[PDB]
Design a protein around this ligand. Sequence first.
Ligand SMILES: Nc1nc2c(ncn2[C@@H]2O[C@H](COP(=O)(O)OP(=O)(O)O)[C@@H](O)[C@H]2O)c(=O)[nH]1
Length: 168
Amino acid sequence: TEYKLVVVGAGGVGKSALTIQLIQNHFVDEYDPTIEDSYRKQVVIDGETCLLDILDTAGQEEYSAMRDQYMRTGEGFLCVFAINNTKSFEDIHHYREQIKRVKDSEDVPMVLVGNKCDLPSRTVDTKQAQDLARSYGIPFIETSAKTRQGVDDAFYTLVREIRKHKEK
Ligand SMILES: Nc1nc2c(ncn2[C@@H]2O[C@H](COP(=O)(O)OP(=O)(O)O)[C@@H](O)[C@H]2O)c(=O)[nH]1
């Protein structure tokens, strides 16, 4: 019954930084006497227990066998680029197309995230990203793992997108 969230995007856009921040804000210790030591950590976002995974496709993951498995298992996807990395924005479409193909669905919960919005070097405008998100039919939000701007909102929005999808 857990919501399965997957964070995708080019290397270095801040997927780990965003996910670490979310866990730091929202992890709790839950009593469960049916497990070994009786307590397990979990993340609760907007009243939903959430599992979290990060999908990289470059670096060490250039050798991975698991890309499609991440996309099949994930129920909603944070598609992250960095506002100071034009290439990472240009990479977004490929990730979305792969997810849609692997899941064989036109209705996949997603949120477009423009991270590193605290940095003064901007090469991807808000308008560009909002136009892309509108074409996809998904929300767009700008975030900064450094200043914490938008981080919680990005994950909370994705949870609501998954919730609506499961309501259908
Ligand atoms: N200024 C700034 N730097 C960030 C932000 N998020 C991540 N970084 C930095 O970008 C670099 C790569 O981030 P990382 O989380 O490893 O990206 P990943 O490869 O997508 O998981 C690190 O040095 C982070 O400190 C942000 O919002 N603002």
